[PDB]
Amino acid sequence: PTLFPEITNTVRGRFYIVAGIISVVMAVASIAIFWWIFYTITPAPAPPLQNPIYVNYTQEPTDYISAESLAAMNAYIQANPQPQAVQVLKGMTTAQISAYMVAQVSGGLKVDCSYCHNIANFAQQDGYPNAAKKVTARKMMLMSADLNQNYTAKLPASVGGYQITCATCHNGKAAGLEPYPIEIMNTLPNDWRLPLELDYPGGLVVTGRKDVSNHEVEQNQFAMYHMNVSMGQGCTFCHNARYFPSYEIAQKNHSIIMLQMTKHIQETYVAPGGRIADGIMAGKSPSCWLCHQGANIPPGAAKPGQVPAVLSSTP
Amino acid sequence: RPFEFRTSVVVSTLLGLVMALLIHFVVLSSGAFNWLRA
Amino acid sequence: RPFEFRTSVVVSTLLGLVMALLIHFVVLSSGAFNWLRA
Amino acid sequence: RPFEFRTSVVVSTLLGLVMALLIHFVVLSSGAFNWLRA
Amino acid sequence: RPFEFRTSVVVSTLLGLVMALLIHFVVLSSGAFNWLRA
Amino acid sequence: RPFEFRTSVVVSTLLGLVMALLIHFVVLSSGAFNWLRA
Amino acid sequence: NDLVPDQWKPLFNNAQWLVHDIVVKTIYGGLIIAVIAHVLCWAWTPWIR
Amino acid sequence: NDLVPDQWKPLFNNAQWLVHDIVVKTIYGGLIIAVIAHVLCWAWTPWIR
Amino acid sequence: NDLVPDQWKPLFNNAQWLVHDIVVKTIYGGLIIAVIAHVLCWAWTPWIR
Amino acid sequence: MAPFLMAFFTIVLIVATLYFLSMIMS
Ligand code: BCL
Ligand code: BCL
Ligand code: BCL
Ligand code: BCL
Ligand code: BCL
Ligand code: BCL
Ligand code: BCL
Numbered sequence A: 001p002t003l004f005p006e007i008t009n010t011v012r013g014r015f016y017i018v019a020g021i022i023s024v025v026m027a028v029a030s031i032a033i034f035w036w037i038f039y040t041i042t043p044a045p046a047p048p049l050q051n052p053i054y055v056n057y058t059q060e061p062t063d064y065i066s067a068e069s070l071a072a073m074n075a076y077i078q079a080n081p082q083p084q085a086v087q088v089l090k091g092m093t094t095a096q097i098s099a100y101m102v103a104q105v106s107g108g109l110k111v112d113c114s115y116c117h118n119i120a121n122f123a124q125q126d127g128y129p130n131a132a133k134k135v136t137a138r139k140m141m142l143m144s145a146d147l148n149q150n151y152t153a154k155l156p157a158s159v160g161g162y163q164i165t166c167a168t169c170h171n172g173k174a175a176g177l178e179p180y181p182i183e184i185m186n187t188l189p190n191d192w193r194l195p196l197e198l199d200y201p202g203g204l205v206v207t208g209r210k211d212v213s214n215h216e217v218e219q220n221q222f223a224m225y226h227m228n229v230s231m232g233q234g235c236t237f238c239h240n241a242r243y244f245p246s247y248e249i250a251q252k253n254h255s256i257i258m259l260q261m262t263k264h265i266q267e268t269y270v271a272p273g274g275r276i277a278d279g280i281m282a283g284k285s286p287s288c289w290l291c292h293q294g295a296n297i298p299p300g301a302a303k304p305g306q307v308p309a310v311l312s313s314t315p
Numbered sequence B, C, D, E, F: 001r002p003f004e005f006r007t008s009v010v011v012s013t014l015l016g017l018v019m020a021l022l023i024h025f026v027v028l029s030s031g032a033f034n035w036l037r038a
Numbered sequence G, H, I: 001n002d003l004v005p006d007q008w009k010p011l012f013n014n015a016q017w018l019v020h021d022i023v024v025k026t027i028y029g030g031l032i033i034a035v036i037a038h039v040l041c042w043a044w045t046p047w048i049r
Numbered sequence J: 001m002a003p004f005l006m007a008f009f010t011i012v013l014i015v016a017t018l019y020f021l022s023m024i025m026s
């Protein structure tokens, strides 16, 4: 009793049905087994870090600090509540000051307290071979305070209350900090650097100028791609691609403040009247990748209200 | 000449090879077995 | 005959050479053996 | 006869030349032998 | 005859010229011989 | 005759001209002879 | 196609029967090796847990 | 095809049997060499651990 | 093809046997030179360590 | 009851396909 004698009675036609069934079953089984294996052997999500004082940076792993160096810390802290010699930290008790050097300044550099000043007497200045590093540390701290109080304050509160600190630039390395690594120089010439010689409210404008050509546009494109790599959000983060000179997206102004701050850093601290002398930072010019490192907010940036009041954006 | 035997050998062999390669790459990149330097 | 001998020889030799090159490159790039300056 | 003598000769010689050039370039770029200025 | 004489001579001459040129540029560019201003 | 005379003449002349031009450009660009403003 | 059995004569030629036999033997050997490898891998490091 | 055995006459010519023998011997030699190389490599540095 | 041995008559012509002999001799010489070069290179600087 | 319902449906599918295939190929 069939309406397909040519399909249900012939041996060849009778094998069509079984072949199709087996093919469908095997395809489904293959897909299911592969995806089950992938989802069963794949690792768990890479979680974030939740330090109360940092964004995406941790100082908690603590073995750079000597087990004996902590003892002289407590011995000095018990000895005197008030700081004997403070020039920048004029408004903190020795308890808070010690809790701040253990947490932030040494955590951002990942160095022992012997790296700066002498364990036998913390407040002595010029009685050991490592005093120049302490002077450089004070100058670095003053620079951080200046940067907080002049450029980060101008940014709106919607961005956040994040403030610059020691771990923002150094990122856990005392010395050997390198802006412009080989990783971020992918499609650019390896000698290229950010052009900190220009006036940034109108420095890189190229649209409809008639006095420039593809050379200037190439330089502008190099700078723009560096900005793209430093943030990791692509070219549409600060621009409306239908008209580049437009001011709509509201991160094109924050970028202006960043450009002015970077130019100020290069002109005041990196090479003030010559990098060879009268200059901290060892002549290493800054870049957007130095702090940001591929994220909108720098991983080492401190949450609002954590740095000392003298160094905060609002003192 | 009948196509059913031949079209089947080729498809089965190709599927097996591709799935084996893909599965070894997925297991290697997962980093959960300590194989080839952890 | 479903398959020529020549096709079998060509396919097998090509697959073998490709697999050998892939395995050598993957073992070299893993950095797990200390071969050719670690 | 499955394969011409000419075809086998051409394939084998081309493979040898390509492999020799590749192997010299890989050995030269590894910096493990101190040859041609270290 | 498996190969023409002209084909063999052309292939050999082209290979020799290419190899000689490549070897001279490689030796020149390494800067290990102090030739043509070091 | 394995090769025409005209083909040999053409190939040899072209090769000689190309080699001479390449050598002149390479020696000029090396900046080692103080020719044409150092 | 006289070597092919009575049941499978309408589907097989005489030359594809031997190739099919070879393929079947290879599949069985591969299955045995895969079972052994999976047992060894499980004994080394369980993946389900 | 009078050199091919009786079983494989429907599949093999007389000129392909010799090449098949050559290929089989080459594959067996390669297998032995690869086994030796893998044994030496494991004795040098185990990759499973 | 009266110079080809009896076993390899169905594969080789009479002009290709000489070229095959030349190729075999060249390959053997290259293998000898390669083994000598590898021994010298190992004596200079071992690449395994 | 996610596994139990899936098992019931799959068993029904297998038994039904067995029955219909036996009906067709006989
Ligand atoms: C390490 C533990 C991993 C894992 C890692 C792998 C890896 C890795 C592989 C598999 C593969 C498979 N896995 Mg497993 N697998 C896991 C857990 C599972 C679970 C489970 C529910 O837990 C299941 C059901 C399976 C099921 C399966 C099968 C689909 C398949 C093996 C059988 C097969 O088809 O053989 C049939 C296979 C054959 C018939 C092949 C025969 C090949 C012949 C022997 C030739 C081989 C090449 C030869 C040496 C080349 C040189 C010589 C020249 C040819 C001349 N896996 C966990 C998560 N699984 C294997 C597979 O076959 O993928 C395609 C595979 O590669
Ligand atoms: C690239 C591969 C090569 C090739 C490589 C080989 C090899 C190698 C062999 C053959 C052999 C055979 N081949 Mg052939 N062969 C090729 C092309 C062909 C073609 C064709 C194109 O028309 C044909 C018709 C054949 C036909 C045949 C038969 C004449 C012959 C015996 C088969 C048999 O009985 O298998 C039945 C048996 C099996 C199918 C065995 C299956 C084994 C499985 C895979 C398990 C293996 C276990 C493993 C080794 C254990 C590992 C231990 C480790 C320590 C873990 N081959 C291709 C081009 N062939 C065999 C032969 O002549 O032997 C004397 C042989 O050894
Ligand atoms: C060192 C230890 C490394 C590793 C490194 C390598 C490397 C490196 C290679 C392999 C290769 C293979 N590996 Mg291993 N391998 C490891 C662990 C494993 C494991 C495992 C589960 O742990 C497995 C299952 C395998 C399995 C395998 C096979 C797929 C294969 C060797 C057998 C084969 O097919 O030979 C069949 C091979 C042949 C028959 C080749 C015969 C070649 C003939 C002799 C000619 C060679 C060229 C000749 C000299 C050229 C010049 C002369 C002119 C021809 C005239 N490896 C670890 C991680 N493995 C080899 C391979 O073949 O990959 C495709 C290979 O190259
Ligand atoms: C120095 C140590 C280096 C290294 C450097 C090299 C270099 C360099 C080369 C090789 C090459 C090879 N290496 Mg080694 N090799 C190393 C370690 C290894 C190891 C190992 C597991 O440690 C292995 C297995 C091998 C294996 C091999 C072979 C694949 C091959 C040599 C054999 C061959 O096929 O000769 C067969 C070769 C021939 C038959 C060529 C014959 C050529 C004839 C003689 C003519 C030559 C041209 C002539 C001068 C031109 C002028 C005249 C005109 C023609 C008229 N190497 C380490 C890392 N090796 C060589 C090779 O041939 O790669 C393809 C090669 O170039
Ligand atoms: C300076 C030391 C350098 C170096 C520099 C060079 C340079 C430079 C060259 C070579 C070349 C070669 N080198 Mg060396 N070489 C070094 C180390 C080595 C080592 C080693 C392991 O240390 C090896 C194995 C070799 C091996 C080789 C050979 C492949 C080759 C020479 C033989 C040949 O084929 O002659 C066969 C060559 C011929 C038969 C040429 C015949 C030319 C005829 C006479 C016509 C010439 C043109 C003519 C003047 C044109 C004008 C007139 C018109 C025709 C009318 N070199 C070091 C690193 N070597 C040469 C070569 O030929 O590379 C392809 C080459 O050019
Ligand atoms: C200055 C020192 C430089 C240098 C600069 C150059 C330059 C530059 C050139 C050469 C060229 C050559 N160099 Mg030198 N050379 C140096 C060191 C070397 C060394 C060495 C190991 O130190 C070697 C081996 C050579 C070897 C060679 C030869 C390959 C060649 C010259 C001979 C030749 O082939 O003539 C064969 C040449 C001919 C037969 C040409 C005949 C042309 C006729 C006479 C017509 C000429 C044009 C005519 C005026 C046009 C107008 C009239 C119309 C035709 C009607 N040089 C150093 C580094 N050398 C020349 C060459 O020809 O390279 C291909 C060349 O151009
Ligand atoms: C590029 C490759 C060359 C070639 C290169 C060679 C070489 C080289 C040889 C032959 C030889 C043979 N070739 Mg030829 N040959 C080619 C093309 C052909 C063609 C064709 C295209 O039609 C044909 C029909 C043949 C046929 C043949 C036979 C006439 C002859 C014997 C084969 C045999 O018995 O193998 C059966 C034997 C085997 C398959 C051996 C397998 C060995 C395995 C691979 C293990 C090797 C281990 C190794 C040596 C040890 C390693 C030590 C290290 C230190 C670790 N060749 C091409 C053009 N031929 C051989 C000969 O004349 O001998 C007198 C020979 O030596």
Ligand code: BCL
Residues within 6 Å of the ligand: D009, D010, D012, D013, D014, D015, D016, D017, D020, D021, D024, D027, D033, D035, E003, E007, E008, E009, E011, E012, E023, I030, I031, I033, I034, I035, I037, I038, I041
């Ligand atoms: C890293 C440490 C060593 C080193 C380690 C080794 C080792 C180890 C080896 C070599 C080998 C060789 N090295 Mg090395 N090598 C070094 C540096 C060099 C330098 C240099 C400038 O310094 C040179 C020139 C060379 C050159 C060479 C070759 C002589 C040789 C590889 C030949 C080849 O390509 O075979 C592959 C080539 C082919 C397959 C093509 C052959 C072409 C034939 C000969 C011409 C035919 C023409 C005709 C028309 C063709 C007809 C058929 C056509 C299809 C139509 N080496 C350094 C100093 N070198 C190998 C060797 O000894 O080989 C014998 C080897 O094993």
Ligand code: HEM
Residues within 6 Å of the ligand: A105, A133, A136, A137, A140, A141, A142, A144, A164, A165, A166, A167, A168, A169, A170, A174, A175, A176, A177, A281, A282, A284
């Ligand atoms: C936090 C206020 C802060 C401290 C503390 C600090 C210290 C410091 C030291 C001790 C060095 C010198 C160590 C060595 O000998 O080189 C040093 C050098 C650099 N610093 Fe710095 N620094 C602090 C803050 C900051 C901030 C916020 C930045 C980023 C703008 C910054 C940058 C640099 C750079 C660049 C150098 C050069 C070091 C190099 O290896 O080249 N520092 N800092």
Ligand code: HEM
Residues within 6 Å of the ligand: A199, A200, A201, A202, A203, A204, A205, A206, A207, A208, A224, A225, A227, A228, A231, A234, A235, A236, A237, A238, A239, A244, A245, A251, A252, A253, A255, A256
């Ligand atoms: C993405 C790679 C990218 C492109 C392309 C791009 C273009 C662009 C142009 C053409 C200008 C000048 C146009 C004009 O006439 O003013 C310009 C200028 C600025 N951009 Fe840009 N820009 C790209 C990327 C980015 C990103 C990701 C940012 C935010 C970090 C950014 C910001 C700015 C700023 C600020 C300027 C002003 C330059 C100045 O006034 O001198 N750009 N960009």
